[PDB]
Amino acid sequence: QSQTQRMYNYLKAKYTATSGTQLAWGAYLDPVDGNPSSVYAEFDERAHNVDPSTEPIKSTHTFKDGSVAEIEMNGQLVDGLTGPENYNITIKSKSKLAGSNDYYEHIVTFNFDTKGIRSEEGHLRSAQ
Amino acid sequence: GQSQTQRMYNYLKAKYTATSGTQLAWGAYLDPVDGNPSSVYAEFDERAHNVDPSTEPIKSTHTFKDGSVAEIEMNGQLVDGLTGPENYNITIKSKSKLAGSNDYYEHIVTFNFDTKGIRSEEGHLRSAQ
Ligand SMILES: [Cl-]
Numbered sequence: 001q002s003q004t005q006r007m008y009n010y011l012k013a014k015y016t017a018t019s020g021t022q023l024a025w026g027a028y029l030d031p032v033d034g035n036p037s038s039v040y041a042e043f044d045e046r047a048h049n050v051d052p053s054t055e056p057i058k059s060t061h062t063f064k065d066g067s068v069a070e071i072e073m074n075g076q077l078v079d080g081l082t083g084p085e086n087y088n089i090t091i092k093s094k095s096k097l098a099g100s101n102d103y104y105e106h107i108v109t110f111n112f113d114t115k116g117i118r119s120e121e122g123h124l125r126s127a128q
Numbered sequence: 129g130q131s132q133t134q135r136m137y138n139y140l141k142a143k144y145t146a147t148s149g150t151q152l153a154w155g156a157y158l159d160p161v162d163g164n165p166s167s168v169y170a171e172f173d174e175r176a177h178n179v180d181p182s183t184e185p186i187k188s189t190h191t192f193k194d195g196s197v198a199e200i201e202m203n204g205q206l207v208d209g210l211t212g213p214e215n216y217n218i219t220i221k222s223k224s225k226l227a228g229s230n231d232y233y234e235h236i237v238t239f240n241f242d243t244k245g246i247r248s249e250e251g252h253l254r255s256a257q
Contacts, residue, residue, distance in 0.1 A: 002244075003239075003245045004158060004244055007154055008151070008154070010246060011151045014147050015148070018140055019144075021140060022140045025136055108136075115132035117132075117136060117253075122251050124246075124249050
C-alpha cells in the first residue's frame with residue numbers, strides 16, 4: 001500500500017521466487033524412494049533425444065509463511081546440436097508482490113551434463 | 129562449494145543473504161532510533177537538500193545466524209540537470225559472497241528520497257573483484 005510497504009513486498013517476492021528456484025533444484029536432484037525424480041527422469045529422456053519434447057513442466061508451491069512461488073522448468077538443445085552436453089535446462093520461478101499482480105521472476109539456466117550455471121537473471125515485472 | 133550442485137545452492141544462498149541485506153538496510157534507513165531519525169537518514173536528508181551533495185558511500189554490514197555476511201553500501205545522487213529533494217535518488221548496494229568463493233551476488237536498488245518509490249532494481253552474480 002505505502003511505498004514503504006511496496007519495498008518490503010518487492011523484497012519478499014524476490015526472496016520467495018529464489019526459494020522456488022531452490023525447491024525446483026532439489027526436486028530435480030533429490031531421489032524419491034531411491035530412484036530419480038519424475039522431473040529428472042523426464043529431462044534425462046529429453047537430453048538424450050535428438051528432437052526432445054519442449055513442453056514446460058509446471059508446479060506451484062506454498063511455503064510455511066504462505067508465500068507462493070509459481071515454477072516452470074523446460075529445456076532446449078543448443079541450436080543445431082544434439083546430445084546431453086548440448087541440452088540446457090531453464091528454471092523460472094515467479095512470486096507476486098503482496099497486494100499486486102506485479103511479480104518477481106527468477107530465471108536460471110544450467111547445463112544438463114555439467115549442472116553448471118549458464119545464465120541467471122531476476123527482475124521485477126509488471127502484471128501480466 | 130566445488131561440486132556444481134553445491135555451487136548452485138551457494139549462489140541461491142548468496143542471493144538470499146544479499147536480499148536480506150537490502151531489507152535490513154531499508155529498515156535501518158527508515159526506522160527511528162530514540163524517537164529521532166536514524167543517522168543514515170539524517171545524512172541523506174542533508175544531502176537531498178544541498179545543491180552539491182556529498183557522493184561519499186555509507187558502508188555497513190549485516191551478519192546472519194547462518195554465518196553469512198551482507199556488505200551494504202548506500203549513496204545518493206541528483207538526477208542530471210535537476211536539483212532538490214524530489215530529484216534525489218538513493219541507491220542500496222548489498223553484496224554477499226558465495227560460500228567457498230570470492231564470487232558474490234550483488235543486489236542494487238534505487239529509490240527516490242521524496243516518494244520512497246523504487247526507481248530501478250537489479251541483481252547479479254558477479255566474479256570476484
Ligand atoms: Cl555436481
